[PDB]
Amino acid sequence: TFVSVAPGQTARITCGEESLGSRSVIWYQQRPGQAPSLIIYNNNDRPSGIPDRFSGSPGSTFGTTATLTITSVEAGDEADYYCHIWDSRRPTNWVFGEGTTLIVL
Amino acid sequence: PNPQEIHLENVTEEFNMWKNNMVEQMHTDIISLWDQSLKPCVKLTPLCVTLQCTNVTNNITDDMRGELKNCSFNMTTELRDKKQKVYSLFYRLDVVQINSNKEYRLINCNTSACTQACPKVSFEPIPIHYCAPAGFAILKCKDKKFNGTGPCPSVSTVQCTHGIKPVVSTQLLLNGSLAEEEVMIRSENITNNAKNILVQFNTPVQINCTRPNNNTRKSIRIGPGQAFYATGDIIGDIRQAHCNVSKATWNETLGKVVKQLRKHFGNNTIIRFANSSGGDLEVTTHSFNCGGEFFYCNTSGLFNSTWISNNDSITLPCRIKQIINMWQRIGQCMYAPPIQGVIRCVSNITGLILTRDGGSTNST
Amino acid sequence: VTLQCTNVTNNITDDMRGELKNCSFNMTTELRDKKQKVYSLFYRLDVVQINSNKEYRLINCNTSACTQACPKVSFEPIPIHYCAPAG
Amino acid sequence: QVQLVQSGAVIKTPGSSVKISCRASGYNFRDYSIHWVRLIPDKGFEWIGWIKPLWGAVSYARQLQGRVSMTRQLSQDPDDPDWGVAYMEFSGLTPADTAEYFCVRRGSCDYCGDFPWQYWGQGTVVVV
Amino acid sequence: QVQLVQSGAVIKTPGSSVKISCRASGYNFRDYSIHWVRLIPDKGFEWIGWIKPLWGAVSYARQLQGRVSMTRQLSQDPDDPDWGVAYMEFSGLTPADTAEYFCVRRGSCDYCGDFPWQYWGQGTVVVV
Amino acid sequence: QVHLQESGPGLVKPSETLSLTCNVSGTLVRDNYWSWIRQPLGKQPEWIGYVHDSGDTNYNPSLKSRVHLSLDKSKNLVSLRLTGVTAADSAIYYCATTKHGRRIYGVVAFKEWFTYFYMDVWGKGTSVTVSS
Ligand SMILES: *[C@@H]1O[C@H](CO)[C@@H](O[C@@H]2O[C@H](CO)[C@@H](O[C@@H]3O[C@H](CO[C@H]4O[C@H](CO[C@H]5O[C@H](CO)[C@@H](O)[C@H](O)[C@@H]5O)[C@@H](O)[C@H](O[C@H]5O[C@H](CO)[C@@H](O)[C@H](O)[C@@H]5O)[C@@H]4O)[C@@H](O)[C@H](O[C@H]4O[C@H](CO)[C@@H](O)[C@H](O)[C@@H]4O[C@H]4O[C@H](CO)[C@@H](O)[C@H](O)[C@@H]4O[C@H]4O[C@H](CO)[C@@H](O)[C@H](O)[C@@H]4O)[C@@H]3O)[C@H](O)[C@H]2NC(C)=O)[C@H](O)[C@H]1NC(C)=O
Ligand SMILES: *[C@@H]1O[C@H](CO)[C@@H](O[C@@H]2O[C@H](CO)[C@@H](O[C@@H]3O[C@H](CO[C@H]4O[C@H](CO)[C@@H](O)[C@H](O)[C@@H]4O)[C@@H](O)[C@H](O[C@H]4O[C@H](CO)[C@@H](O)[C@H](O)[C@@H]4O)[C@@H]3O)[C@H](O)[C@H]2NC(C)=O)[C@H](O)[C@H]1NC(C)=O
Ligand SMILES: *[C@@H]1O[C@H](CO)[C@@H](O[C@@H]2O[C@H](CO)[C@@H](O[C@@H]3O[C@H](CO[C@H]4O[C@H](CO)[C@@H](O)[C@H](O)[C@@H]4O)[C@@H](O)[C@H](O[C@H]4O[C@H](CO)[C@@H](O)[C@H](O)[C@@H]4O)[C@@H]3O)[C@H](O)[C@H]2NC(C)=O)[C@H](O)[C@H]1NC(C)=O
Ligand SMILES: *[C@@H]1O[C@H](CO)[C@@H](O[C@@H]2O[C@H](CO)[C@@H](O[C@@H]3O[C@H](CO)[C@@H](O)[C@H](O[C@H]4O[C@H](CO)[C@@H](O)[C@H](O)[C@@H]4O)[C@@H]3O)[C@H](O)[C@H]2NC(C)=O)[C@H](O)[C@H]1NC(C)=O
Ligand SMILES: *[C@@H]1O[C@H](CO)[C@@H](O[C@@H]2O[C@H](CO)[C@@H](O[C@@H]3O[C@H](CO)[C@@H](O)[C@H](O[C@H]4O[C@H](CO)[C@@H](O)[C@H](O)[C@@H]4O)[C@@H]3O)[C@H](O)[C@H]2NC(C)=O)[C@H](O)[C@H]1NC(C)=O
Ligand SMILES: *[C@@H]1O[C@H](CO)[C@@H](O[C@@H]2O[C@H](CO)[C@@H](O[C@@H]3O[C@H](CO)[C@@H](O)[C@H](O)[C@@H]3O)[C@H](O)[C@H]2NC(C)=O)[C@H](O)[C@H]1NC(C)=O
Ligand SMILES: *[C@@H]1O[C@H](CO)[C@@H](O[C@@H]2O[C@H](CO)[C@@H](O[C@@H]3O[C@H](CO)[C@@H](O)[C@H](O)[C@@H]3O)[C@H](O)[C@H]2NC(C)=O)[C@H](O)[C@H]1NC(C)=O
Ligand SMILES: *[C@@H]1O[C@H](CO)[C@@H](O[C@@H]2O[C@H](CO)[C@@H](O[C@@H]3O[C@H](CO)[C@@H](O)[C@H](O)[C@@H]3O)[C@H](O)[C@H]2NC(C)=O)[C@H](O)[C@H]1NC(C)=O
Ligand SMILES: *[C@@H]1O[C@H](CO)[C@@H](O[C@@H]2O[C@H](CO)[C@@H](O[C@@H]3O[C@H](CO)[C@@H](O)[C@H](O)[C@@H]3O)[C@H](O)[C@H]2NC(C)=O)[C@H](O)[C@H]1NC(C)=O
Ligand SMILES: *[C@@H]1O[C@H](CO)[C@@H](O[C@@H]2O[C@H](CO)[C@@H](O)[C@H](O)[C@H]2NC(C)=O)[C@H](O)[C@H]1NC(C)=O
Ligand SMILES: *[C@@H]1O[C@H](CO)[C@@H](O[C@@H]2O[C@H](CO)[C@@H](O)[C@H](O)[C@H]2NC(C)=O)[C@H](O)[C@H]1NC(C)=O
Ligand SMILES: *[C@@H]1O[C@H](CO)[C@@H](O[C@@H]2O[C@H](CO)[C@@H](O)[C@H](O)[C@H]2NC(C)=O)[C@H](O)[C@H]1NC(C)=O
Ligand SMILES: *[C@@H]1O[C@H](CO)[C@@H](O[C@@H]2O[C@H](CO)[C@@H](O)[C@H](O)[C@H]2NC(C)=O)[C@H](O)[C@H]1NC(C)=O
Ligand SMILES: *[C@@H]1O[C@H](CO)[C@@H](O[C@@H]2O[C@H](CO)[C@@H](O)[C@H](O)[C@H]2NC(C)=O)[C@H](O)[C@H]1NC(C)=O
Ligand SMILES: *[C@@H]1O[C@H](CO)[C@@H](O)[C@H](O)[C@H]1NC(C)=O
């Protein structure tokens, strides 16, 4: 589940099973070696300190995988990404989504 | 067109609401017209099969009891030798357990097999104008403050009455005909207990009723030419059907009906509205139809007040049934087929049907 | 019912396409527990293939089951004289 | 004819709950109300409630709410649609309620009201 | 109401064959004829044909015989008997026939003829 | 300014109760919810559980009995007690703060909503491993 785009372009990294109800996904980053770090804490807003270029798909769409859209990729984005999804029909997820990392040229 | 409302002078007609004609005739007419509108639709005798049900794909909380079950079962094809394993969704008020493992059956299979209403026909009321035959006349009492029994000093003859929408509502009669100036109560004998008190008020209170799931209907072919419309998947979230009434307008209309009802019991009496006492589900709760779906909406949020001698909304929940037993006959149902999309209907409550309590013991 | 059809006892030429099929199938008896294996002849414009082996069904079973005309009644035209009512 | 038969007499304990049956036969059960009245010695009659067995809408007396409960059971049968059962589940039984209990039905004439109870059950005495 | 929806625009090769759908909804389909007309640029309108969808009897123009073909598909369903589909399988496509193609239906008044085509499809342009 | 300090043995023998503590900086423990995050090597991390005073101490129902979480009001810490060290829990561990928040998707009075969590800030991790 690796993806590699040239630096400066855009990328769509996807995760999670198809959507059943309304969902409030969250999105995590893991630079190799260190602790993780929060990226998106709802569908489409991020905490302070975490910049822009981290846009996400909304949760209101039904029957839609949980994606994360980046524009203007750079070498700092060379890390691991994770979805942690909270579907309002399927029960709560005590384990994260599948590890789908991203490296740049 | 232009029905001849002809006024008459110097006439005192003795009207009576309660020993009237034209109502048992209308009731027999509407139930016979109900019966004739189901004969060409299909019969569901091949569906009384042992269903294997389970819970819907949902985060089941223990306090909230799910009103949907996911039931799969064998069913014949149009080819009589072969059978198919199909699945559908039913409401918990339509299936019953047969006794570990879980097996369900429909609620009516030990009483009567019954008819899916063929969904080209619809259930909204259209106005019916009753007309007298030749050699008969229809009188209309044009008085305003007319409680419904006795002399009416201003009558008028009509060839054909105005638009009567036949609605089926149990309490809180909807889409009715308003009053003129006041809120009018009426009874046959108000000091009796067994006779209902009919209340009709002047300005209506609007009510917004919805179910917010979108069912996807699917066609399961039973045999040659006969299809059965089942509920497929719920896309999006599952939620409970409900209705909204404006709180300030409801409080104002209850204030008006208390100010009217104090004229018959003394002014210094404390009027207390309580919820329904009990019985079957079609009388304990507000039952109606909305776009071809039968709602049973709880009513304890409205009829709960105590009135002494001196932008918010009320949300009241509902439960919906697919198998009805309207008019309470012995061998009938109607399996109402599901409707695609979310369902919203806006109507205007014009009246109420009340009942006193048969009080002894020094009750103030 | 799922009919099992075959060709009629005939010198089948490839150019001439036979308008008769010989179809055998189960059918219920008046005793509901038992069934009989019967055979009949149908026209090719009445059966259709269900998809080697060959199995056919009737042409109308996915649209409408339908009625054999009970053959005491007939279909020749008799003359009808239309008449006006009085007035 | 019209018959109203009850269940036999019972002896219960204070705080328990009695359940009185009332089987009605000989008329179309889904039409006429069924009233329940009691007879306490040395206090005269006292009404309890009524039930309309078409749907099951009830009404109880004001001094007995939260104690009484009435159900019905119709005859889902197209061959004998006449018979039917009414019930009373009288709970909160105290030593004052030693009495006789009748289930009654109104008359069938046109100018009969609802309260002129014509047909009477045999009555069931409870002693606590 | 009455709706006539078509299929989307297509780009085909010379000598191939196009197949234009025309779904009609909102009326009893087994009654009224469906006509097919085309619009070539710089030559005005030009009729193609008509089809009576009860059985399927067609009629084509004289200059287009041996190229066009029209079928229909009824709604064998007693629950929505209104909708229906007409088809045109226009074969022998040459570079002259780059055009827009409309499927039309006549009016519903009594003194309406057959050729006063009231209800129109959205039209489908083909380019070869 | 917050930064957390995980502390544990790291090398554990099997059939033993793993314990681990988390020293705090900046803010104390009681005023927010805390959570324990496990991550084995080269895969998805899994969430163990989250704690707060007044009964807000739900665990992973997969574990649910093999682990008990606890609080340290006295020393301003928060602890982990694991039981029955298998071969699977050889992983890096994290204590991490969390903030709640309600996703509302229907009528509010019908209990038609839920509470999603998210770990905002993290510690450094502790690579606990089991040997024989
Ligand atoms: C009978 O009456 C009853 C009651 O009177 C009616 O019941 C109501 O029914 C409706 C119908 O669904 C329910 O609506 C939902 O409401 C939720 C909650 O909204 C509330 O909370 C919002 C946020 O809270 C704010 O305050 C808290 C502190 O209190 C703070 O912590 C928080 O951070 C935030 O600051 C408020 O914004 C919201 O206000 C809304 O309404 C105001 C009214 O005038 C208006 O002024 C505001 O501008 C705003 O519009 C309200 O207070 C909604 O969140 C929910 O909508 C989401 O979900 C549905 C389904 O999932 C989806 O279709 C919607 O599009 C929406 O999804 C967006 O929001 C998600 C939030 O995370 C987001 O994740 C999604 O991706 C999506 O994001 C959108 O915005 C983002 C930017 O954030 C953007 O990037 C995206 O592209 C996208 O555009 C529903 O609307 C009511 O809750 C319910 N009850 C009540 C009490 O009203 C009943 O309907 C009546 N029946 C009839 C028949 O009339
Ligand atoms: C009511 O209950 C019924 C009975 O269970 C449910 O119907 C089943 O729902 C499940 C959902 O999990 C379906 O399972 C999915 O099947 C896919 C294959 O599709 C075909 O497979 C069957 C044979 O098994 C065919 O007969 C049929 O024609 C299907 O078209 C799989 O690909 C799916 O895999 C899922 O999981 C993997 C890994 O987890 C993911 O990668 C996939 O993307 C996918 O999400 C899955 O196994 C099953 O097909 C349904 N059965 C039928 C007969 O339809 C209803 O959903 C339920 N209703 C409600 C409202 O809850
Ligand atoms: C449509 O298709 C069906 C199905 O095949 C045909 O029906 C069969 O036709 C064959 C013709 O070959 C019949 O076979 C003959 O059966 C005779 C015995 O009669 C009884 O036997 C069966 C059991 O097998 C009983 O159930 C039944 O009641 C019969 O009454 C044999 O004696 C025949 O032998 C022939 O060959 C020998 C040697 O070759 C000769 O010496 C004989 O004289 C004779 O010619 C033969 O085997 C078979 O019985 C039919 N079945 C049924 C159920 O009727 C239809 O013929 C066909 N229709 C058309 C129009 O083609
Ligand atoms: C799917 O549904 C489950 C329920 O079936 C739901 O789990 C519950 O979520 C809530 C909030 O996420 C948990 O938190 C509770 O919140 C209230 C309000 O603060 C507290 O009072 C609760 O404390 C007690 O209640 C619990 C009830 O059993 C006790 O188990 C608990 O130990 C406390 O004594 C508590 O903090 C709640 O604990 C869970 N319940 C369970 C059993 O997990 C879940 O969130 C839903 N998930 C999704 C994605 O919809
Ligand atoms: C049963 O039906 C078969 C056909 O399914 C039939 O066999 C054919 O009979 C005719 C006459 O008996 C054969 O003769 C042909 O006659 C014409 C006219 O002269 C010639 O042009 C034919 O020459 C060519 O046609 C054949 C067609 O396949 C070629 O196979 C052949 O090699 C020549 O190229 C030919 O002379 C004809 O050949 C047969 N066909 C076969 C396949 O046997 C048979 O007679 C019928 N029997 C009964 C009892 O009804
Ligand atoms: C649809 O029809 C089929 C066919 O009858 C039903 O399947 C049957 O289900 C029963 C269980 O109730 C099976 O019996 C079991 O068989 C197994 C052997 O596989 C045996 O080990 C068990 O002890 C038990 O006897 C039966 O075999 C099975 N038949 C077939 C052909 O599979 C099915 O229940 C019906 N409903 C649905 C929703 O599929
Ligand atoms: C009219 O209003 C009253 C009070 O608001 C309602 O009474 C309450 O009804 C609910 C539902 O039946 C009762 O809850 C249930 O109690 C039983 C035990 O009897 C329990 O087994 C169930 O799990 C559930 O908890 C509730 O106890 C009851 N409260 C009182 C004080 O009587 C009444 O239902 C309303 N009437 C209608 C028609 O809605
Ligand atoms: C509830 O009932 C009332 C009356 O039964 C509904 O109508 C309201 O009152 C009058 C009477 O129909 C409406 O005026 C009408 O306007 C049309 C168009 O101008 C005209 O053609 C009619 O002859 C008549 O004059 C009035 O518009 C309407 N009120 C509103 C606010 O629209 C009422 O619509 C029903 N529903 C609700 C939600 O109140
Ligand atoms: C009339 O009804 C009978 C009874 O169902 C039908 O016979 C059945 O035909 C099937 C073939 O489609 C048989 O299955 C086969 O069984 C053999 C064992 O003999 C096995 O080796 C094959 O692999 C296959 O499974 C089935 O056993 C057979 N049943 C009986 C009782 O004989 C028949 O097709 C129907 N129609 C006619 C025209 O007879
Ligand atoms: C669906 O199956 C059964 C039947 O509903 C569920 O078990 C009960 O569910 C109700 C709520 O629907 C709870 O109140 C009970 O406590 C449950 N009983 C038991 C023994 O669990 C079950 O929870 C549902 N879900 C699944 C996945 O089976
Ligand atoms: C409820 O379900 C219906 C499907 O029955 C949804 O309709 C779909 O809407 C999208 C967007 O317009 C279309 O692309 C699909 O083609 C529609 N489905 C079908 C079968 O045509 C509808 O949007 C849903 N509504 C909600 C609020 O969930
Ligand atoms: C019932 O539905 C109607 C229709 O939407 C609501 O009327 C709207 O009310 C809002 C809020 O006051 C106004 O902004 C709109 O202009 C109104 N629209 C119309 C067409 O009148 C009404 O408020 C709803 N009633 C309740 C109790 O929710
Ligand atoms: C009945 O009406 C009252 C208001 O007249 C509602 O308010 C509650 O009343 C009960 C006792 O009747 C109190 O115990 C609650 O504290 C009251 N609620 C609040 C928020 O103060 C009551 O909700 C109504 N009943 C129903 C079922 O809606
Ligand atoms: C009857 O069975 C099949 C089905 O008709 C016949 O096979 C085809 O028959 C047609 C004419 O009916 C020929 O045009 C085809 O070329 C035949 N195809 C094959 C693959 O043979 C078959 O010939 C008939 N007769 C028998 C004895 O089976
Ligand atoms: C009670 O109050 C009403 C209010 O108008 C009044 O008409 C009536 O006479 C009063 N009755 C008594 C007995 O005071």
UniProtKB/TrEMBL annotation, chain B:
Compartments reported by the entry: Host cell membrane; Host endosome membrane; Virion membrane
Chain's gene name: env
Part of the intact protein present: 78 to 461 of 860
Region spans: CD4-binding loop: 276-286
UniProt note: domains: The CD4-binding region is targeted by the antibody b12.
Family: Belongs to the HIV-1 env protein family.
Annotated S-S bridges: 41-118, 48-109, 53-71, 131-160, 141-152, 209-243, 209-290, 209-345, 243-297, 243-318, 290-345, 297-318
Organism: Human immunodeficiency virus type 1 (HIV-1)
Role, per record: Envelope glycoprotein gp160: Oligomerizes in the host endoplasmic reticulum into predominantly trimers. In a second time, gp160 transits in the host Golgi, where glycosylation is completed. The precursor is then proteolytically cleaved in the trans-Golgi and thereby activated by cellular furin or furin-like proteases to produce gp120 and gp41. Transmembrane protein gp41: Acts as a class I viral fusion protein. Under the current model, the protein has at least 3 conformational states: pre-fusion native state, pre-hairpin intermediate state, and post-fusion hairpin state. During fusion of viral and target intracellular membranes, the coiled coil regions (heptad repeats) assume a trimer-of-hairpins structure, positioning the fusion peptide in close proximity to the C-terminal region of the ectodomain. The formation of this structure appears to drive apposition and subsequent fusion of viral and target cell membranes.
Domain Human immunodeficiency virus 1 envelope glycoprotein Gp120: 66-364
Residues annotated as glycosylated: 10, 52, 55, 59, 70, 74, 99, 101, 110, 147, 175, 189, 202, 208, 214, 251, 267-268, 275, 298, 304, 310-311, 344, 348, 362
Known partners and oligomeric status: The mature envelope protein (Env) consists of a homotrimer of non-covalently associated gp120-gp41 heterodimers. The resulting complex protrudes from the virus surface as a spike. There seems to be as few as 10 spikes on the average virion. Surface protein gp120 interacts with host CD4, CCR5 and CXCR4. Gp120 also interacts with the C-type lectins CD209/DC-SIGN and CLEC4M/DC-SIGNR (collectively referred to as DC-SIGN(R)). Gp120 and gp41 interact with GalCer.
This protein's name: Envelope glycoprotein gp160
UniProt PTM: Highly glycosylated by host. The high number of glycan on the protein is reffered to as 'glycan shield' because it contributes to hide protein sequence from adaptive immune system. Palmitoylation of the transmembrane protein and of Env polyprotein (prior to its proteolytic cleavage) is essential for their association with host cell membrane lipid rafts. Palmitoylation is therefore required for envelope trafficking to classical lipid rafts, but not for viral replication.
